[PDB]
Amino acid sequence: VAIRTIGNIMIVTTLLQFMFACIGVQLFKGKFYRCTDEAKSNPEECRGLFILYKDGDVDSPVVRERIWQNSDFNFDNVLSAMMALFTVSTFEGWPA
Amino acid sequence: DANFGRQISYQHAAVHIPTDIYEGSTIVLNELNWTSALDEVFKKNREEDPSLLWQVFGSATGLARYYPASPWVKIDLYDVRRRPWYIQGAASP
Ligand SMILES: *[C@@H]1O[C@H](CO)[C@@H](O[C@@H]2O[C@H](CO)[C@@H](O[C@@H]3O[C@H](CO)[C@@H](O)[C@H](O)[C@H]3NC(C)=O)[C@H](O)[C@H]2NC(C)=O)[C@H](O)[C@H]1NC(C)=O
Numbered sequence: 391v392a393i394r395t396i397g398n399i400m401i402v403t404t405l406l407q408f409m410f411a412c413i414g415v416q417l418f419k420g421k422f423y424r425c426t427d428e429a430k431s432n433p434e435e436c437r438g439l440f441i442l443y444k445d446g447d448v449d450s451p452v453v454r455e456r457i458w459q460n461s462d463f464n465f466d467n468v469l470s471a472m473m474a475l476f477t478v479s480t481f482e483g484w485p486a
Numbered sequence: 487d488a489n490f491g492r493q494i495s496y497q498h499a500a501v502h503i504p505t506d507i508y509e510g511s512t513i514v515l516n517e518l519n520w521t522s523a524l525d526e527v528f529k530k531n532r533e534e535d536p537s538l539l540w541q542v543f544g545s546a547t548g549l550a551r552y553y554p555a556s557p558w559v560k561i562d563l564y565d566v567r568r569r570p571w572y573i574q575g576a577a578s579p
């Protein structure tokens with residue numbers, strides 16, 4: 391009974407989340423990509439191997455691959471935007 | 487071979503591409519095509535003076551092509567553009 395009497399608010403907030411997800415799709419469509427090393431800034435450069443300096447030490451290098459990978463939570467399409475906005479609305483991982 | 491600490495081949499010239507440079511990029515492959523004509527001059531020099539040590543062309547794109555071909559020697563941090571012999575010929579004091 392409590393669920394039935396409160397269905398009006400759920401529809402309104404779902405519609406608001408949908409609108410914000412559409413706006414977020416328009417704003418951050420595909421812009422969340424990044425390379426494995428913060429030196430190459432396009433997919434044509436994020437290929438091959440690179441030297442990684444562990445913990446910022448210049449005397450402790452290690453070879454690692456370059457991968458042009460998308461973010462775990464992004465705004466590519468409507469479903470991804472809705473998921474990201476849900477995680478934000480749960481007040482968790484939203485600063486990142 | 488004698489007067490050489492490694493196993494070498496005179497049939498062609500080896501190419502060293504540093505780790506922080508991706509082979510197969512447009513810049514590198516283009517440099518790997520027109521430099522393939524140096525191998526004939528590498529053999530011609532060795533014919534006249536058989537007691538000739540490494541002949542190397544240090545490209546400004548990073549890759550170094552040396553003759554005779556021999557396998558390269560932890561991680562590899564070699565870069566031909568930072569070598570003392572490259573720097574003196576790329577500029578003045
Ligand atoms: C840069 O790469 C180019 C692409 O491979 C090279 O151009 C090709 O060189 C081939 C080797 O000579 C040519 O094949 C033969 O060339 C001789 C010389 O004129 C002729 O017998 C014919 O043109 C040809 N024979 C065939 C096709 O049966 C290619 O024609 C030529 N062009 C292509 C493949 O488009 C360049 O040589 C290379 N640069 C350097 C410095 O090596």
Ligand SMILES: *[C@@H]1O[C@H](CO)[C@@H](O)[C@H](O)[C@H]1NC(C)=O
Nearest residue numbers: 530531532533534535536537
């Ligand atoms: C090399 O130098 C010698 C003298 O050291 C000289 O006689 C000779 O002509 C030069 N060239 C060749 C191909 O030996």
